[PDB]
Amino acid sequence: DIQMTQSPSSLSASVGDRVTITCRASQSVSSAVAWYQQKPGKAPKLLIYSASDLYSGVPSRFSGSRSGTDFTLTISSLQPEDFATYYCQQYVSWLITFGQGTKVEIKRTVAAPSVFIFPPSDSQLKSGTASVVCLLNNFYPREAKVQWKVDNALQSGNSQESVTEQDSKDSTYSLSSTLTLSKADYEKHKVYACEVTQGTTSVTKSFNRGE
Amino acid sequence: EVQLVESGGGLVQPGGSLRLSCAASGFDSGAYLRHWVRQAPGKGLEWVASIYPSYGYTSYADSVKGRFTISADTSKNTAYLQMNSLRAEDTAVYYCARSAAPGMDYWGQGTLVTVSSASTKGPSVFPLAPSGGTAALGCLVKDYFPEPVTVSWNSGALTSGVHTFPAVLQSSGLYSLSSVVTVPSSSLGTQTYICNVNHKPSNTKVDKKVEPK
Ligand SMILES: [Cl-]
Ligand SMILES: [Cl-]
Ligand SMILES: [Cl-]
Ligand SMILES: [Cl-]
Ligand SMILES: [Cl-]
Ligand SMILES: [Cl-]
Secondary structure: OOOEEEEOOEEEEEOOOOEEEEEEEOOOOOOOEEEEEEOOOOOOEEEEEOOOEEOOOOOOOEEEEEEOOEEEEEEOOOOHHHOEEEEEEEOOOOOOEEOOOEEEEEEOOOEOOEEEEEOOOHHHHOOOEEEEEEEEEEEEOOOOEEEEEEOOEEOOOOEEEEEOOOOOOOOOEEEEEEEEEEHHHHHOOOEEEEEEEEOOEEEEEEEEOOO | OOEEEEEOOEEEOOOOOEEEEEEEEOOOOOOEEEEEEEEOOOOOEEEEEEEOOOOOOEEEOHHHOOOEEEEEEHHHOEEEEEEOOOOHHHOEEEEEEEEEOOOOOEEOOOEEEEEOOOOOEOOEEEEEOOOOOEEEEEEEEEEEEOOOOEEEEHHHOEOOOEEEOOOEEOOOOOEEEEEEEEEEHHHEOOEOEEEEEEEHHHOEEEEEEEOOO
């Protein structure tokens, strides 16, 4: 029933930068605070206990401190593999509560995606649906506009995107866009095109149905 | 080494029940609590319950009180979470963890619980068939429920360059995802590429040979 407020909720910093994450307890938690690192979909990893004690094996770039109800995690020199969501936790009792989390992204130089487009498989067309897939591979920053054109007509409403998490070594993203049409609609048109815009550059990959 | 291995979990209807298990190895004493902590999709960590196995003392979060029970079989080194009267808000990855009776130093691998009335359905797997020196290929994994599917390539011998995208919920209420990999153009046709798609919730594995079109 005691709140732990993390700040910021997310941040982007460059490799070798100093990163500061804070966490304020609603009441007195004494020093009973731990810090965790969690890669997406993986179990959290203990970093710091008792506000400032490093856990076995944790690189010394991680450090924690306490001032009354205000707790700080510091990464003195951010490395690419430190991309994660970081969580504070109190355990003054046991009525444990976690902070809301701070997602840390690695800031990097711009990298243009390698763009690929995939027609639907003949196997899928037998089922009455056509999925056209556009791949944006190993790019930075994450923000990119991806548009579908069919016979040069701009599409809307019929696609969905998904994005990988940051690569732990080169800090890039990959992105898929999937266009769903009925087979009938697919067979009525020739040119399928995926257009990717970033900054001053827009790249369109296409195929002609049947070729 | 200390290990916490979770089992149980999967799909269950609202109002239904599930029992999670957390089997412990490698402990040097029993002066440890056991915890259940859950993570709803896209959300933060939430403590659920604690037990001191040797004594039976338990502790619960308001959000699960009178609905979930934690217990322990010391003779089997196993803590349990009996989850009754489940709601959709209970859908999450459930972690078991230990801490000294310190911090939560060891955690299980997590197990997904999906509370929903929708039916299990295995995936359909279609090829993404293969400019310059690098070509991409992949497998589209379409229309399954519930999560998760895992994907590997060439039975694990191909790992670098693989991107397996997080699943997206389609408007049909089924999940979809793709897995892609980039390889040298010259390797097409001299190399065979196979995606291995595992959907344990339906006890189905699909291997798809991805050939040039
Ligand atoms: Cl770590
Ligand atoms: Cl390109
Ligand atoms: Cl046409
Ligand atoms: Cl043990
Ligand atoms: Cl919590
Ligand atoms: Cl299939």
